[PDB]
Design a protein around this ligand. Structure first.
Ligand SMILES: *[C@@H]1O[C@H](CO)[C@@H](O[C@@H]2O[C@H](CO)[C@@H](O[C@@H]3O[C@H](CO)[C@@H](O)[C@H](O)[C@@H]3O)[C@H](O)[C@H]2NC(C)=O)[C@H](O)[C@H]1NC(C)=O
Ligand SMILES: *[C@@H]1O[C@H](CO)[C@@H](O[C@@H]2O[C@H](CO)[C@@H](O[C@@H]3O[C@H](CO)[C@@H](O)[C@H](O)[C@@H]3O)[C@H](O)[C@H]2NC(C)=O)[C@H](O)[C@H]1NC(C)=O
Ligand SMILES: *[C@@H]1O[C@H](CO)[C@@H](O[C@@H]2O[C@H](CO)[C@@H](O[C@@H]3O[C@H](CO)[C@@H](O)[C@H](O)[C@@H]3O)[C@H](O)[C@H]2NC(C)=O)[C@H](O)[C@H]1NC(C)=O
Ligand code: LMT
Ligand code: LMT
Ligand code: LMT
Ligand code: LMT
Ligand code: LMT
Ligand code: LMT
Ligand SMILES: *[C@@H]1O[C@H](CO)[C@@H](O[C@@H]2O[C@H](CO)[C@@H](O)[C@H](O)[C@H]2NC(C)=O)[C@H](O)[C@H]1NC(C)=O
Ligand SMILES: *[C@@H]1O[C@H](CO)[C@@H](O[C@@H]2O[C@H](CO)[C@@H](O)[C@H](O)[C@H]2NC(C)=O)[C@H](O)[C@H]1NC(C)=O
Ligand SMILES: *[C@@H]1O[C@H](CO)[C@@H](O[C@@H]2O[C@H](CO)[C@@H](O)[C@H](O)[C@H]2NC(C)=O)[C@H](O)[C@H]1NC(C)=O
Ligand SMILES: *[C@@H]1O[C@H](CO)[C@@H](O[C@@H]2O[C@H](CO)[C@@H](O)[C@H](O)[C@H]2NC(C)=O)[C@H](O)[C@H]1NC(C)=O
Ligand SMILES: *[C@@H]1O[C@H](CO)[C@@H](O[C@@H]2O[C@H](CO)[C@@H](O)[C@H](O)[C@H]2NC(C)=O)[C@H](O)[C@H]1NC(C)=O
Ligand SMILES: *[C@@H]1O[C@H](CO)[C@@H](O[C@@H]2O[C@H](CO)[C@@H](O)[C@H](O)[C@H]2NC(C)=O)[C@H](O)[C@H]1NC(C)=O
Ligand code: NAG
Ligand code: NAG
Ligand code: NAG
Ligand code: NAG
Ligand code: NAG
Ligand code: NAG
Ligand code: NAG
Ligand code: NAG
Ligand code: NAG
Lengths: 374, 374, 374
């Protein structure tokens, strides 16, 4: 009878048979282990580590602006002005901004043949050591194989390059644009959690326009002003701005958006920290500091090309936005509940071992617990 | 006998003893709860949320190109041409592209001393309010401490800057390059899932060269043409291009690559949406819109430096590529199967509570279920 | 008595009753399935796939520098020098670097009216086909509606553009800057795992300054030199540099930082691979290769604007840094242990099916296992 079998399946309840052993020590140990498992599963997995939540990584867009002007007026270059259009190269970058702090300039370079800067490698005599096509470490020009006179006292290998070649052996000390220490950087950050489709920007709802006109970030007094002074950025990373400005470097401004979207959106707040991203190691490094070369191009009255070559040392400020949002989800919750239910059986296993192998009456309990089918 | 014990361990099967209670209500409730747990575990965890899959985040590379030219011919600037080399600054960017839509120009600036633009802060009389070294909000020059004549009717504080200083108090209305509304942007996207080592590009296999010569993206008619009109990009985000072009802004073009790699690769398709990334808030904002300054550098016949300063307003288009791929994995599958097996015992727990504490014959069932070892 | 009930709850141990069936086949199958589940849970989940670890994605910062100079000296352009400031456009980029390998130049362009380059679309006669405002495919200028003479033998539509218009119909072959094959690229990479707060850079502790002065990356001999030759980068991706240099392309240099932070930090090492990111498909592509336009701006003696337009073909090198770190965590460990404990019951289920439905004495075992409460 299939119908009778189905009715029996539906209208009967099956529960296991249990043996109740009266022992203070074993019972207390069983309860202690069960309490130890429950405390783990609740306090650590759920309350502490939030095992009931799904997570999503942040999607960020950043806008950066620098303010400040430096005035130098020396003999070689004369009176010079350095505003934002002069010391920010290139005009725009993604999640980054370079500020020039030291400079070496070479004005009126033309394409042609010229001697190199005298040193151990380039200095020559009799046009014998020079090798055609050898660019050398400079890699600024291609050697023509001839050995010409740099000046009245030394002879160097001739190269095909923009001439005269740059001389970068004397980096200015202190940094040329050392006034950049008091420039200020604004960081505007818009974040997005696509999974929860949640958006926020780092200028909080209580941060007004009047306040943003004169604020400077401070970890204690102004923890949410998005305007940072460069010297203070370097100082908060554990370094010195004047030391770092001579040869340049990389500075990380990292924004943490760890948020709990179970609570009010007003508590999803950014946290700022600062970390130097380049390393000082004179024995395990190549191209220390931070610099690059760019040029300004001109034209002679006859149409011949001329350029000013700039070797720009400076600090690159990288904006690093990271963080995870969390919202309650039923799948991790049920996974953890089932895991705890399964783990509650380790107490039974351990107590069975004790009852059956480390007891005086273990044979009696073995007889009571196990039935041999014969 | 160790061998006898091992044989007993290997050649015996152990199964629990079960009590079968005949009750329609309790049995039906047991089956209902078991069915409720099975339906959860299958339908929600496996079928709906794909709990049998491992996931991997996308690695993306983007190439962007703009097409279009604008012709303006006014009195101050005369006849001007704006092609791609003029309104895209810088020539290249990563996952981004800036299009200039409004402009303020200052031609023939030289480094020197000049008065500021008259306003409440800068206007002065008798050379008393001026403070040396105070850059002011302009931060375009350093105040020299002298109060000089801007013109015949007002006196302002003298600054060391590129002179004459920029006057950005009258932003053109409507936008200067308002013809950028009909420029078109091409977005080429190559994606990579390293875990599954799967690659695809957003130009699908059925998208031909002839079609790509004249297509424009439409959510309904051309959902896979990677060529977007700028005005339409802004419109699909819920905004107006002409309004946004006066002061600039940030526009997000986000590409979603949510794919199921259990199926054919032909179904891994990109989905396009548009979202404005900057905020309009006159009470809780600093530096609204989007603009930056860059310069073109020239040289006098005597070698003196001159520059044209450009304050460029425009819209930055950010390409945001996100998504996760999914493939069947055995580890999550077995974790979910074990979790469901463990969770099936909640029905037993609940039915035991009912049988032992909320029944008329609960004492009889308690006697039948539990054995006291004495 | 509540106290008596509590004492009974605390001082009693409950364990299930078991039926022991003596059968070689069923017992052996039970043990085989249990061993098969244990081998899975240990070997695959724990030992092989490291199911006892939490993971974290890498946060990376990259610095790139190119070295090399090319000398060309032809008739149209004359003697030219191309150093780093000439062929890297823009001076700086994020996680990227473009090297120019082919070039088309247009010198002395002025804003005005000029004919187009003769072709099927532009050629005209009698000033009838020309349409005012139609930018055309060139989109370099706006058509004025007039049909003027390109030269003595053909007439084309007049446009408002920078004049004369660029002629990009003859891309140089072989590439103009084909000497870029032996340029070298340095990639400095600093990584950070915020969850474990672990930092490392790709210049390893045993990589000295003397070694870095002359090393070139090789997968077999120098697997940790961060200096790559461009031609070799393209070759290791399965392509030819000279072929790729004519029209340009995108090359991916991907750094893998898969590390196990349970072990010494000295074993967290970078792995380098190379993949071309652009596709060759003459039937399913738009804008093949890789190129962009930028200009150098000059000024006439009268102050009129002039520019040199450069169409730059080249290879964009993208630095793709990915990887996950792993450290032992107790939560995944306990989840997997509980899952295995739950999964160990499938053996009992299967063996019960066999014992109760596929046995000669199945009725006797059914009587021994199940108790009917009456
Ligand atoms: C805008 O709303 C935010 C969110 O609540 C306010 O942030 C709060 O700012 C105060 C100080 O401005 C913080 O108190 C400080 O705590 C540190 C210890 O970390 C202590 O050293 C300082 O002396 C000071 O007491 C407060 O912690 C912070 N709230 C949170 C949740 O971080 C903010 O004040 C509001 N207004 C502005 C202008 O930001
Ligand atoms: C190339 O292959 C793709 C992949 O199948 C084709 O995509 C399909 O495109 C059609 C229209 O071109 C879509 O139909 C449209 O559906 C919307 C509703 O979302 C409706 O409003 C429209 O009127 C139209 O019926 C179709 O959904 C879409 N397939 C998928 C899976 O999204 C494409 O058509 C092929 N050819 C080209 C030139 O893209
Ligand atoms: C610095 O420390 C690293 C870390 O151990 C050293 O890496 C080791 O480099 C050698 C060769 O320089 C590798 O051996 C090579 O193995 C390949 C097979 O993949 C074989 O084809 C080669 O012939 C060679 O035997 C070795 O695998 C590698 N160690 C690891 C863990 O990858 C490095 O040598 C040290 N010094 C320098 C200058 O890098
Ligand atoms: C996220 C966490 C996941 C884990 C969740 C765990 C929830 C599990 C609930 C289990 C409920 C146990 O339910 C209760 O168990 C005890 C033993 O413990 C039973 O009690 C039984 O054994 C005890 C101990 O020997 C005897 O004193 C008693 O006479 C006998 O009835 C109760 O009759 C039953 O009502
Ligand atoms: C190749 C030769 C064979 C290789 C053999 C591989 C090893 C096989 C032995 C694995 C034995 C697993 O042992 C199995 O453990 C579970 C608990 O997990 C016991 O389960 C029983 O007792 C435990 C406590 O002891 C309770 O928590 C549980 O509710 C109850 O059902 C089973 O009665 C036993 O069969
Ligand atoms: C991803 C999902 C994970 C969860 C997977 C769950 C699979 C578990 C399979 C369990 C199989 C149960 O197997 C079947 O159980 C029923 C009770 O339910 C037993 O039936 C027993 O109890 C019932 C109910 O009181 C009585 O009517 C019957 O006389 C008695 O034999 C069957 O003898 C056994 O064959
Ligand atoms: C400090 C003082 C002590 C602190 C004590 C901490 C709490 C300890 C009590 C936790 C009790 C857990 O209770 C335990 O639950 C499981 C189900 O999960 C029961 O398990 C038994 O009955 C349930 C249904 O009721 C079945 O699903 C299961 O197959 C069967 O083995 C155990 O018989 C019981 O011992
Ligand atoms: C990450 C992995 C997670 C899974 C971990 C599994 C650990 C579980 C440990 C279970 C321990 C089982 O513990 C052991 O089980 C066997 C059966 O297997 C019991 O043995 C019982 O059944 C066998 C088989 O019919 C009989 O031969 C024997 O007379 C009887 O006592 C032992 O008395 C008990 O000590
Ligand atoms: C709408 C009509 C009703 C819809 C019904 C939905 C289906 C309900 C039936 C699901 C039955 C689940 O069946 C349940 O399986 C577990 C194992 O998983 C059995 O559990 C028992 O036997 C198995 C082996 O067979 C052992 O591993 C386990 O330790 C023991 O407790 C239960 O005795 C049985 O009740
Ligand atoms: C920059 O410094 C130079 C001197 O180093 C200044 O030029 C001199 O200024 C003094 C004081 O006014 C005069 O007496 C000299 O005649 C000036 N010329 C020289 C060659 O010394 C110069 O003025 C400074 N820059 C500015 C903007 O004033
Ligand atoms: C950055 O600004 C500080 C002031 O905030 C400068 O230090 C002060 O300079 C003035 C002169 O301009 C002195 O009178 C003060 O004694 C200095 N110290 C303080 C605490 O005010 C500092 O020189 C600036 N950095 C530069 C110019 O590189
Ligand atoms: C830009 O507009 C100006 C006028 O605003 C044009 O110059 C005038 O054009 C008219 C019509 O041909 C002439 O009669 C005038 O003599 C021109 N000069 C002036 C000062 O008005 C100018 O032609 C326009 N740009 C172009 C490219 O044509
Ligand atoms: C962008 O293009 C549209 C056309 O697609 C321009 O609007 C049309 O302009 C022409 C004149 O060129 C008028 O005759 C039409 O009536 C206009 N509307 C339509 C629907 O065609 C629009 O002006 C352009 N945007 C600019 C120039 O900023
Ligand atoms: C670039 O090539 C040209 C010729 O193609 C060189 O100019 C000629 O060089 C020869 C050999 O010295 C002379 O005899 C000719 O008088 C030169 N002029 C011409 C018009 O041919 C030129 O020298 C080469 N570039 C450099 C830097 O030498
Ligand atoms: C890149 O460098 C290689 C050498 O490493 C050049 O090939 C050699 O060129 C020299 C002449 O300069 C010849 O004598 C050799 O026979 C060539 N082969 C070898 C194996 O040395 C190659 O021409 C360079 N690429 C360029 C110039 O595009
Ligand atoms: C020539 O140059 C070298 C190196 O710069 C220098 O040491 C030497 O004094 C110079 N000779 C003269 C006469 O200036
Ligand atoms: C996310 O929420 C915003 C605000 O409610 C809404 O405009 C947007 O469409 C939402 N995104 C999705 C994918 O629904
Ligand atoms: C550029 O063109 C102008 C006229 O437009 C001419 O006067 C000048 O000489 C030219 N210069 C060059 C270098 O071709
Ligand atoms: C001087 O400049 C101010 C501000 O631009 C202006 O209001 C005033 O009319 C000017 N004076 C003369 C005589 O033009
Ligand atoms: C991924 O697949 C492609 C195409 O089959 C292959 O060229 C590449 O080597 C694969 N990657 C790995 C890591 O095996
Ligand atoms: C630049 O050099 C050229 C010769 O190469 C010379 O005629 C010109 O006067 C120089 N100009 C400057 C500003 O040095
Ligand atoms: C005019 O230009 C066309 C296209 O460049 C060319 O074919 C033709 O020969 C030219 N005419 C003369 C006389 O050079
Ligand atoms: C990470 O470790 C470094 C080195 O010990 C330390 O300077 C830094 O503060 C640590 N980060 C955190 C968040 O503790
Ligand atoms: C630029 O200004 C200088 C004086 O500073 C003057 O000699 C020159 O003619 C001006 N040129 C233009 C184009 O305004």
């Amino acid at each position: 009878g299939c119908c009778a079998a189905l009715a029996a399946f539906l209208f009967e309840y099956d529960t296991p048979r249990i043996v109740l052993i009266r022992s203070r020590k074993v019972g207390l140990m069983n309860r202690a282990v069960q309490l130890l498992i429950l405390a783990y599963v609740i306090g650590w997995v759920f309350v502490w580590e939030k095992g009931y939540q799904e997570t999503d990584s942040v999607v960020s867009s950043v806008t950066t602006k620098v303010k400040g002007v430096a005035v130098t007026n020396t003999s070689k270059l004369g009176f010079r002005i350095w505003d934002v259009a002069d010391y920010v190269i290139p005009a725009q970058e993604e999640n980054s901004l370079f500020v020039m702090t030291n400079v070496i300039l070479t004005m009126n370079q033309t394409q042609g043949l010229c001697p190199e800067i005298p040193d151990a490698t380039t200095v020559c005599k009799s046009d014998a050591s020079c090798t055609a096509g050898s660019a050398g470490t400079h890699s600024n020009g291609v050697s023509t194989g001839r050995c010409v006179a740099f000046n009245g006292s030394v002879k160097t290998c001739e190269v095909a390059a923009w001439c005269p070649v740059e001389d970068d052996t004397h980096v200015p000390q202190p940094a040329f644009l050392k006034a950049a220490e008091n420039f200020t950087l604004l960081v505007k950050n818009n974040i997005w959690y696509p999974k929860f489709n949640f958006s926020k920007r780092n200028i909080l709802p209580n941060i007004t326009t009047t306040y943003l006109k004169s604020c400077i970030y401070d970890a204690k007094t102004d923890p949410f002003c998005p305007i940072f002074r460069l010297g203070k950025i370097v100082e908060n990373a554990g370094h010195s701005f004047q030391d770092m400005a001579v040869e340049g470097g990389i500075m990380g401004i990292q924004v943490n958006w760890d948020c709990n979207l179970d609570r009010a959106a007003s508590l999803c707040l950014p946290r700022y920290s600062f970390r130097r991203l380049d390393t000082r190691d004179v024995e395990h490094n190549v191209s220390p500091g931070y610099n690059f070369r760019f040029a300004k191009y001109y034209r002679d009255l006859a149409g011949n090309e001329q350029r000013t070559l700039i070797k720009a040392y400076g600090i690159r400020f990288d904006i690093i936005v990271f963080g995870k949002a969390g919202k309650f989800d039923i799948i991790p919750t049920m996974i953890n509940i089932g895991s705890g239910l399964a783990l509650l059986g380790m107490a039974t296993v351990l107590c069975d071992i004790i009852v059956l192998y480390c007891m005086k009456k273990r044979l009696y309990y073995r007889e009571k617990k196990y039935k041999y089918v014969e």
